Ligand binder design. Structure first.
Ligand code: ZN
Lengths: 72, 120, 55, 160, 139, 144, 189, 143, 101
RNA sequence: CGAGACUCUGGCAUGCUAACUAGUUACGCGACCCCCGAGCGGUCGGCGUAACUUCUUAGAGGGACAAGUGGCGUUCAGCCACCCGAGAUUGAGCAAUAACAGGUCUGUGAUGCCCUUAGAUGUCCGGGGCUGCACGCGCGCUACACUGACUGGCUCAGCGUGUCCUACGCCGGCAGGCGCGGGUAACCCGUUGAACCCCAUUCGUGAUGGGGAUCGGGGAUUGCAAUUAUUCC
């Protein structure tokens, strides 16, 4: 089967990012991509929005793996 | 006909080192190194055959062993027989091949048409 | 003339301009240390030149 | 212009190898033993090990002057820069080159194959060695290559 | 008042100079925390994180490194850090401190005071490597 | 507490010295910077708009470590892995001209001195600018 | 104290099986800061049970062809893998590692016995060191399979196997392969 | 990021269909004639953000990117980046694009075949042109 | 006369043993000013040849080597002594390349 | 005889012999920093004496012998395990007797016969061919991707060659040009600034930016000559 993710957010999909995602206990661009039908660049950048909002902590950042968490 | 934005007659009367800016890199590379004693001799003899024809007649063929000779614009309209290791091949120098070598108009090999394969 | 057409080929590069200094052969030369021997005559004369087979 | 020290000892190697093959291809049937190049920077003194020293000098030294005139004209180093010397290897049985050339001379003389091999093999053990073999291979009779082998004493084959 | 020893892995050779100092351990001019493959940072901290800072207090350590690769240079230093403090505690401090502190290191890793002799084997013909050979085909 | 270049995280030291040179404003930028690769072994043009500055910043850093580098040695410095098509890969050097006019621009800021011994070294003014950028990184790291 | 990665401790880590206890490393004096140690553990037999089992998970993760010498690549895959375990579970991930190892290595295996051309396996017993060796291999291999051609990371997909085996769940790869080798053996007996 | 509403999913440039949802430094490459390396230099002369997607842009950005693609020397794009450097009939430097490059490989093939050069026969025969061992490789597609 | 460098290059160390340790022996016997015999890196000339002169067999190779051992020894004296001792001690395969200043 | 013994290599030596064509340490001098409110400290492949051999190099000499302990042994040959130890089986070279009608007259001025020897099978020259292409079979290279690719940044070798290796300026987008210097070599290339690796950036499961074959245009070097693309951009 084909996997056609979105490239920019939808009104509903940006809500799932804002509301659901900061309560996962494990937030990662691969995970967000897997649960929301979103390409890796968009989901990788959306987590940088959610650091700017302060909604989400930061555990580790690397070339290939960046790991985020629910808020405390 | 036009070559590099230069018409037929303007090519024929163009200076020698002015051709060394219209050619490609191999020809300009070779022309800066200069033609040799063997090669002006062919170009000399190509003038005479083209000189001695009736105006309805193509010139008499001039046979040659020089395959890596540059087709200069002096040579246009000539009849040239080129040795492919075996046989001189009658090649009329059409005006559109004026940047190439002679030898790629006289084939060496025969085009292969297979039969059946043998034992092995 | 034949004065002109005899040794007319420029043999200062390529394989023609090098041969063995023992057996005149120009296949498989050892050009390394200014040796210029074929790979058999070097193997023949290797004790007298001084190349000891150790390793 | 000087030569690289890598390239120099190689060029000294091709000098002795060509000089020894020169004296092998010439002084073979005249009792030859060996080349001893002794590089004195005034004169490249070349000492010739041999057995018949009188049969390589010539007549009051005719050939020894011929030979040292060949070398100057060959390797280019000038006059008065080379001497020659004949010192006899009196232990001709110990030298394998002499005994493989004495056996070359007898086989070229049309003697028997076994006779000359036993003559040499008895000689060198009488000459004080501790072991020796003589192999002669090739045409001995007919259109078939055979191999003969005349072993006496001890023969180390492996190692340093 | 000064002791200079080496350590060594495959081809890397790191030489540490120690004198009566004030707790600086610099390798090749730059600090221990700055050396680039920081995925292996703790392997360079292991002579410190086992003996504590208090032993590296009256000692100044310069390390001079050449050769090897990245990993091989990391392990060549941690030899030479460790071997020097041991050799400093011999000549200038009593032997009982030397034994005490040598025993803490070796029980963590024997590598810290004696080096691997395993170095690269010679490749032989008929194959790409020291033991390996080319493919062959039958029939 | 006198900081140095060597006491600092180096790939942030370069990021600091780069943005220093845009704020200085005077640095000769060639007009081909919008156009070209850095070597033959690189696939594409570099991503950064201001790549000339950080490569200028990288170049002054290497001169501080060893003084005496030429244009060819800098072309060796940013060398890479030429992927030779389906033939196996090899080492290829950078470009001589980008390595030239970087050293030539920073010579214009009196940061780079041309040497007795051939190459280019770093002026004592240039040694001031690095160690002042080194303070700006060491402070923003150890106090934050 | 000697923390793995400077942040994970060893004294919490508790071994269940006495069968595996002497053949699974770090508890107390094996405790080392990094997996990367580079010692001669295959110099003679039964020396590779004394090396830390995080380094065992390392050396079996560089294992494939394109990755086949790159150890610092791998101790980075390990380091990011424990911190995904901790954020999904909260347990000391070394305990999750050991509980995933113990549940993974099979306990009876089949073995071909008989002449050539005859295929009649008989069940035999599984060695304790081999059950360690079989489990790590079955753990690392499951990280390749669900993460060879998708977006998920191998520092991530390792931590999804290494959790799903400490549950002994059916979702793990190393559990289905234990549920086959030890299923086939009890039809050979 | 965010949700633009003037986001064309489908671009129609030079009779070629460009996927609007791709990065624009790699959606120009969807036409013939343009690769990766030339498209970056086209967009930098256009001074358009490489970060942004191809559907995200206006019309005046798109048609001036077209204009810089059509007329590269005018916008100081050098002559060594060009598709067709010295065209033999006129000696004129250009960058040749999708329907044109399709039309102007036929012109080089109809040149060398009419002249009966060596390469012209090769393309007429279907064989290897750059002087290659045809004994062993290039097998598939025959009877 | 001052700063007399002597350079020795042989092929075997045993002849180079006897010579190089006799120069420094006789210079100090004549009460001179020497540097120690310093030892250059030994050159190793490697030529790898096939054994077969056919190309038939099991692709077996010969690893031939040549080694060159180079020594330096310095002096500070009027050079009347140098020509005396050195030109007598002639061992075949041992070369003396004495340069001054 | 072969095996072994042997030679070379490797591993160990803070012991010995030495070092201006190798260094370290110290002391001068300079540059630079934070400063304190002077410094000191530091980094200096920045350059000058002195101390000397840890590092470098290479010479001699030691070192390991199943030695020591515990078991097993027709208890002795030898084996196992372990302590001390750098090392408890380093990797090669050489390799008997006998053969094969294995391979090589296309390595030889090593060669026996036979053949050809001036409308030459000698030899030079010119042009071609060894590559040709429906198809089989072998050694290989690069890939099929995200443990990736790209773009920046950062930081490490060794055996080696060199009269052609090259440095350093300059003009070159780039292959390259021009000039000027070193090196017959531990003196110069060169501290041989290697690559994956490391750290950020970008891209997200699709024939994709993976993958580069095949094709069109140009540009430059080598050579007498690039046409049947030498190689390179
Ligand atoms: Zn020969």
């Amino acid at each position: 089967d084909k996997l056609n993710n979105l490239v920019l957010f939808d009104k509903a999909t940006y809500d799932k990012l804002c509301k659901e995602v900061p309560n996962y206990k494990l937030i990662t661009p691969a995970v967000v991509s897997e649960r929301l039908k979103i390409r890796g660049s968009l989901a990788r950048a959306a987590l940088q929005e959610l650091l700017s909002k302060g909604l989400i902590k930061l555990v580790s950042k690397h070339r290939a793996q960046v790991i985020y968490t629910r808020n405390t | 006909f036009t070559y590099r934005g230069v018409d037929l007659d303007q090519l024929l009367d163009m200076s020698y080192e002015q051709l060394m800016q219209l050619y490609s890199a191999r020809q300009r590379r070779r022309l800066n190194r200069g033609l040799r004693r063997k090669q002006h001799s062919l170009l000399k003899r190509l003038r005479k055959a083209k000189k001695e024809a009736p105006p309805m007649e193509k010139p008499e063929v001039v046979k040659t062993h020089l395959r890596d000779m540059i087709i200069l614009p002096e040579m246009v309209g000539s009849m040239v027989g080129v040795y492919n290791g075996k046989t001189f091949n009658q090649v009329e120098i059409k005006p559109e091949m004026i940047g190439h070598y002679l030898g790629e108009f006289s084939i060496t090999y025969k085009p292969v048409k297979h039969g059946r394969p043998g034992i092995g | 003339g034949h004065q002109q057409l005899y040794w007319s080929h420029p043999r200062k590069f390529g394989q023609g301009s090098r041969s063995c200094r023992v057996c005149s052969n120009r296949h498989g030369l050892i050009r390394k240390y200014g040796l210029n021997m074929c790979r058999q005559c070097f193997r023949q004369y290797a004790k007298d030149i001084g190349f000891i087979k150790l390793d | 212009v000087q030569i690289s020290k890598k390239r120099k000892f190689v060029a000294d190697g091709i000098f002795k190898a060509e000089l020894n093959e020169f004296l092998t291809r010439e002084l073979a049937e005249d009792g030859y033993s060996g080349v001893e190049v002794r590089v004195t920077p005034t004169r490249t003194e070349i000492i010739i090990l041999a057995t018949r020293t009188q049969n390589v000098l010539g007549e009051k030294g005719r050939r020894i002057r011929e030979l040292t005139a060949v070398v100057q004209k060959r390797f280019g180093f000038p006059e008065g820069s080379v001497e020659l010397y004949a010192e006899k290897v009196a232990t001709r049985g110990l030298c394998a080159i002499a005994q493989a050339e004495s056996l070359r001379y007898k086989l070229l003389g049309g003697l028997a194959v076994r006779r000359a091999c036993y003559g040499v093999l008895r000689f060198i053990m009488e000459s004080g060695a501790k072991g020796c073999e003589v192999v002669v291979s090739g045409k001995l009779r007919g259109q078939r290559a055979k191999s003969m082998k005349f072993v006496d004493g001890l023969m180390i084959h492996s190692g340093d | 008042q000064s002791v200079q020893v080496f350590g060594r892995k495959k081809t890397a050779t790191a030489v540490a100079h120690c004198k009566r100092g004030n707790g600086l351990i610099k390798v090749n001019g730059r600090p221990l925390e700055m050396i680039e493959p920081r995925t292996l940072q703790y392997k360079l901290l292991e002579p410190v994180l086992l003996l504590g800072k208090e032993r590296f207090a009256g000692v100044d350590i310069r390390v001079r490194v050449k050769g090897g690769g990245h990993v091989a240079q990391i392990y060549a230093i941690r030899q030479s850090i460790s071997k020097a403090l041991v050799a400093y505690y011999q000549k200038y401090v009593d032997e009982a401190s030397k034994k005490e502190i040598k025993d803490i290191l070796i029980q963590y890793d024997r590598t810290l005071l004696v080096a691997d002799p395993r170095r690269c084997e010679s490749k032989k013909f008929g194959g790409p490597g020291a033991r390996a050979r080319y493919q062959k085909s039958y029939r | 507490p006198g900081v140095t270049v060597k006491d600092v995280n180096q790939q942030e030291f370069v990021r600091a010295l780069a943005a220093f040179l845009k704020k200085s404003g005077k640095l000769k930028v060639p007009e081909w910077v919008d156009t070209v690769k850095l070597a033959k072994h690189k696939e594409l043009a570099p991503y950064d708009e201001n790549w000339f500055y950080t490569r200028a910043a990288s170049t002054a850093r290497h001169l501080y470590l060893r003084g005496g580098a030429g244009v060819g040695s800098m072309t060796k410095i940013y060398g890479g892995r030429q992927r030779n098509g389906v033939m196996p890969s090899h080492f290829s050097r950078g470009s001589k001209s980008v390595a030239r006019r970087v050293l030539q621009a920073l010579e214009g800021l009196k940061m780079v001195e041309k040497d007795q011994d051939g190459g280019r070294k770093l002026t004592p003014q240039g040694q001031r600018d690095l160690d002042r950028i080194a303070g700006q990184v060491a402070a923003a790291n150890k106090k934050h | 104290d000697i923390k793995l990665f400077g942040k994970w401790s060893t004294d919490d880590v508790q071994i269940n099986d006495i069968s595996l206890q002497d053949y699974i490393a770090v508890k107390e004096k094996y405790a080392k800061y990094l997996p990367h140690s580079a010692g001669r553990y295959a110099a003679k037999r039964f020396r590779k049970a004394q090396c830390p089992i995080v380094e065992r998970l390392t050396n079996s993760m560089m294992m494939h062809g394109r990755n086949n010498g790159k150890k610092l690549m791998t101790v980075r895959i390990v380091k990011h893998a424990f911190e995904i375990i901790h954020l999904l579970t909260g347990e000391n991930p070394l305990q999750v590692l050991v509980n995933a190892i113990i549940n993974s290595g099979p306990r009876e295996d089949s073995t071909r016995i008989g002449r050539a051309g005859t295929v009649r396996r008989q069940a035999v017993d599984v060695s304790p060191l081999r059950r360690v060796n079989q489990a790590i291999w079955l753990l690392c291999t499951g990280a390749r399979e669900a993460a060879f051609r998708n977006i998920k990371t191998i520092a991530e997909c390792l931590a999804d196997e290494l959790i799903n085996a400490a549950k002994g769940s059916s979702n793990s790869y190393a559990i289905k392969k234990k549920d086959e080798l030890e299923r086939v053996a009890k039809s050979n007996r | 990021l965010v949700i633009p509403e003037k986001f064309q999913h489908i671009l129609r440039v030079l009779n070629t269909n460009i996927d609007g949802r791709r990065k624009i430094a790699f959606a120009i490459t969807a036409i013939k004639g343009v690769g990766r390396r030339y498209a970056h230099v086209v967009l930098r002369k256009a001074d358009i953000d490489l970060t942004k997607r191809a559907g995200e842009l206006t019309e005046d950005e798109v048609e001036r990117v077209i204009t810089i693609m059509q007329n590269p020397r005018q916008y100081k794009i050098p002559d060594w980046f060009l598709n067709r450097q010295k065209d033999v009939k006129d000696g004129k430097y250009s960058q040749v694009l999708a329907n044109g490059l399709d039309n102007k490989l036929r012109e080089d093939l109809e040149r060398l075949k009419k002249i009966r050069a060596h390469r012209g026969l090769r393309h007429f025969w279907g064989l290897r042109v750059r002087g290659q061992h045809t004994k062993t490789t290039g097998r598939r597609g025959r009877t | 006369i001052h700063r007399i460098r002597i350079t020795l290059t042989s092929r075997n160390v045993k002849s180079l043993e006897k010579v190089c340790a006799d120069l420094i022996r006789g210079a100090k016997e004549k009460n001179l000013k020497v540097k120690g015999p310093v030892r250059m890196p030994t050159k190793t000339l490697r030529i790898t040849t096939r054994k077969t002169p056919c190309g038939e067999g099991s692709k077996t190779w010969d690893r031939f080597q040549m080694r060159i051992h180079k020594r330096l020894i310095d002096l500070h004296s009027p050079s009347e002594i140098v020509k005396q001792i050195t030109s007598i001690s002639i061992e075949p395969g041992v070369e003396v390349e004495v340069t001054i200043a």
